[PDB]
Design a protein around this ligand. Structure first.
Ligand SMILES: *C/C=C1/C(=C/c2[nH]c(/C=C3[NH+]=C(/C=C4\NC(=O)C(C=C)=C4C)C(C)=C\3CCC(=O)O)c(CCC(=O)O)c2C)NC(=O)[C@H]1C
Ligand SMILES: *C/C=C1/C(=C/c2[nH]c(/C=C3[NH+]=C(/C=C4\NC(=O)C(C=C)=C4C)C(C)=C\3CCC(=O)O)c(CCC(=O)O)c2C)NC(=O)[C@H]1C
Lengths: 489, 489
């Protein structure tokens, strides 16, 4: 993923035209509620410092500049050496607490030949986390898991709003569960455009799992100097939780009325599955010991989301097992595929919950249920021959095939399967007039203004030419039956 | 899985003949370092109690018997009602701490219409767990992950021995990492028979993830009464950590010299992947707040084991990618499969690290490398025709095919692939004389004595007629190439 140079290196202004390429990993600034130091990995000499480090460490910038970490932190320097060896990934963190003439929290991570240290004040429900773990593990489905997760984070952090945001293959997520204070606007059930979380944002969020913005009305504190003296290059602050949030997302949060934000990634199989989005109407800083709990819950959700999704599919397959057996049995002892598969006792329509069925064998076809007219069927099979693969799935045929949207009332959803495409089975679902609740704007209205939008209320998009999407278990069952009948002939 | 009736219901004596069917889930007794109460799920009336509950609660058994949990625990009863609704799984636990005229730890779980409560004393490294999490996540391979896990548990619990025990498809596990005190016997690298952890033991360990034996020289405390008054049946103590360990495993631990034991399951995909086995030479009771850390580490290992295994396979596939490309390219433009695939430029031997290659096409075969004689090849293909499937894998051909062990020196490992078996490719690996370090006895010597064995030192079994096992990536690559060449013809 490409990136523009930062603003302090002659970088262009970030607009909705090019926000996809903003270098958020190197803002050259941090958030003011904490101090940041940058030291050498081998010698320990301090190289960079935020302009407010003097207020956090009680010493002048010219005093700390050039001081070795051995003299500044004699009790912690060898632990830093042993904990972060050279060549370790930048996601490895080491945290401790220090006594300063209050108590500070120091989190160090290594980015190449550079040691990054974060200082933020910390203070010194023990079983709510364990009970939360056992509650998440015993949740019956993904919806209940999401409700227990949101309610748990809500009861643990005191945030005004806590929600679980689930991404889609087109990067447009949806609030699947919400735990909010009374009187707040409900974002539950709303879908949001992919523009709100750009590509490099999700990419960064797949590696560094937690980030926050403690005060959306707080100016960032720069570093001195902004360029790393080792390489005369920007300092990678991707792993720093104190990293200055991009001004785009801060203007976005202020337009939403959010005073403080935070999110923890839910990564599954190396892909960003979702986020635990947190909102507070007023500025708020969570103690680090409390954030660690949210990180544990992030790992737990990463595991349980996988488990619960797998189980939710396996239950549907269990629901279709016996029917699969009957169809396979009848198919094995078949002398005419048309007469055998079109038998109502097999009920190939109810298997996939389809309103139309097209069976192509021996150079001819037969229908079953509400189907398009005959020349439309000829055009649909002649269209299917052009597509490669053994399976075709779509909940809106008009998107994959123009001039086929005329067939939307009878055949809007298509699930076809081949045995080349000379002998195939086509499942058709009729059109279902849908209303999608968007959170302010559809993806079409995301690039109309050069700044982040101000409207976030419910926007009901009337989607037409669509059918009910195919459940994942219907597709798994589909290809299983595809290998079955392909083996039978 | 069947079970004998317990000893208190006319059950037979447990020997090595029938230890596979011991009802460990209902010992009718608990470990003496804690108290256990059994109450009704609807009314809260206490129904059962351990014979030492008076020493833990300061009240006579006749006093507590029949008392409602509302009167006994007024501060906790509604929390128990709301936390454990009827119909919830027995793995759901709710833990709190109480002040008793010291401080106790109460863990409650629901088994049907029965509430089970556990009382054990608790006392009131904050960042070692977070640093442990980041260290486990940044481990490069599974071996390093196991070393960091064992070292972490060792430094957190103070156990004399901590090890990671990885199961095999035949339920015979191996100590893949070990963190032990100086001078102790090393179980690292030793394989152990499946008899040590029976079937119902692993089955129970897949659902309830932690169990322990705080003192192997401590007699169990029974319940009063032993039968549940609701059903006149034994009380299921499978979820109770205070459950009396089976006497078989306690005699086993004493024969090993272990004073205190504990293990946390590492479940992956619903299957028991491994265990975090812990040993202490003297009796030891871990505080519950400390065990919760080990449970968190159990979830973390359940996630990271999956990640690291997937990555370790993906690295091998990456190592074979280019070679796969070359073989596919040459195979597409083929006019003679024998001449094309036997070309040394393709190097089909080095792809799978095999010493012999048999190519069967167009009704004839050709060899490549060290292979059995011609009639042995005819018998090997005529044998392959009888086996169904597209792939055959074995690291010891003599096991799958007697009279074929005569071909062990040239062909001990076999990896065959079909395109029926009329046209196939066979990879052969020569015999490798192996020495397997067993921990006391091989599976053959596990049923010679009616009690658990006393010998646990290294027993080097000289395994002959075996080859180097096929790496999982070699098999994935094998079937990928199988669909490739099958599609090419
Ligand atoms: C043209 C660029 C745009 C843009 C940039 C942008 N956005 C982020 C980070 C986030 N955006 C989020 C979106 C949401 N927050 C919500 O509460 C909801 C719905 C209730 C949505 C859809 C989120 C969650 C983040 C992560 C940060 C956080 O949790 O607060 C960044 C990167 C910021 C950073 O962390 O460094 C950037 C550059 N956002 C847009 O809307 C367009 C205009
Ligand atoms: C014929 C029955 C036998 C038998 C029964 C048995 N075993 C268990 C439980 C365990 N056995 C374990 C085995 C090992 N512990 C080790 O340290 C090593 C190698 C260093 C091995 C192979 C383990 C770990 C357990 C789990 C309990 C624990 O962690 O201490 C049970 C069930 C006990 C319970 O928890 O209720 C039973 C009935 N063991 C045999 O060896 C044969 C004779």
């Amino acid at each position: 993923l490409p990136f523009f140079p930062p603003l302090y290196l002659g970088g262009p202004e970030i607009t909705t035209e090019n926000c996809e390429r903003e270098p958020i990993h190197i803002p050259g600034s941090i958030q003011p509620h904490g101090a940041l130091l940058t030291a050498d990995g081998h010698s320990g000499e301090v190289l960079q410092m935020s302009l407010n480090a003097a207020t956090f460490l009680g010493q002048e910038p010219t005093v700390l500049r050039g001081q070795t970490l051995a003299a500044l932190l004699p009790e912690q320097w060898p632990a830093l050496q042993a904990a972060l060896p050279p060549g370790c990934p930048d996601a490895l963190q080491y945290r401790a607490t220090l006594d300063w003439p209050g108590h500070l929290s120091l989190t160090v991570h290594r980015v190449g030949e550079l040691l990054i240290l974060e200082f933020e004040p910390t203070e010194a429900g023990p079983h709510a986390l364990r009970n939360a773990m056992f509650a998440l593990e015993s949740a019956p489905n993904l919806r209940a898991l999401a409700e227990v997760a949101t309610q748990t984070v809500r009861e643990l952090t005191g945030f005004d709003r806590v929600m679980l945001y689930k991404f889609a293959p087109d990067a447009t997520g949806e609030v699947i569960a919400e735990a909010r204070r009374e009187g707040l606007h409900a974002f539950l059930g709303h879908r949001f455009p992919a523009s709100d979380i750009p590509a490099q944002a999700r990419a960064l969020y797949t590696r560094h799992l937690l980030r926050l913005t403690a005060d959306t009305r707080a100016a960032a504190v720069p570093l001195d100097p902004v360029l790393n003296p080792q390489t005369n290059a920007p300092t990678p602050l991707g792993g720093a939780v104190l990293r200055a949030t991009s001004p785009m997302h801060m203007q976005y949060l202020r337009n939403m009325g959010v005073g403080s934000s935070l999110s923890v990634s839910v990564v599954v199989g190396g892909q960003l599955w979702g986020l635990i989005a947190c909102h507070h109407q007023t500025p708020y800083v969570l103690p680090p010991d409390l954030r660690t709990t949210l990180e544990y819950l992030g790992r737990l959700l990463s595991l349980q989301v996988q488990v619960k999704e797998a189980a939710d599919v396996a239950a549907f397959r269990q629901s279709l097992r016996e029917h699969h057996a009957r169809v396979a049995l009848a198919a094995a002892h078949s002398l005419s595929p048309h007469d055998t598969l079109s038998d109502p006792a097999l009920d190939l329509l109810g298997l996939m919950r389809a309103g139309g069925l097209i069976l192509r064998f021996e150079g001819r076809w037969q229908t079953l249920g509400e189907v398009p007219p005959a020349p439309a069927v000829d055009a649909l099979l002649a269209w299917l021959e052009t597509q490669p693969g053994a399976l075709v799935q779509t909940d809106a045929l008009g998107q994959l095939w123009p001039a086929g949207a005329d067939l939307a009332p009878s055949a809007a959803g298509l699930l076809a399967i081949s045995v080349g495409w000379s002998e195939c089975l086509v499942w058709l679902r009729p059109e279902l007039r849908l209303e999608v609740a968007w959170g302010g704007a559809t993806p079409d209205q995301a690039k109309d203004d050069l700044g982040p939008r101000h409207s976030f209320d419910t926007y009901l998009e009337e989607k037409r030419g669509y059918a009910e999407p195919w459940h994942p278990g219907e597709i798994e069952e589909a290809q299983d039956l595809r290998d079955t009948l392909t083996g039978a002939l």
